[PDB]
Amino acid sequence: AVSEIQFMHNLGKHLSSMERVEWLRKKLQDVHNFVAL
Numbered sequence: 654a655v656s657e658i659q660f661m662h663n664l665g666k667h668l669s670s671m672e673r674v675e676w677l678r679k680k681l682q683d684v685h686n687f688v689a690l
Contacts, residue, residue, distance in 0.1 A: 665673045
């Protein structure tokens, strides 16, 4: 069975459910908490 690129990719495709919920917090803070330069 696959468990590296097919896995994870065929799981968080829409990115808007449990597991794909904490992800979105980094989508906005990633280039906001640091930036400056």
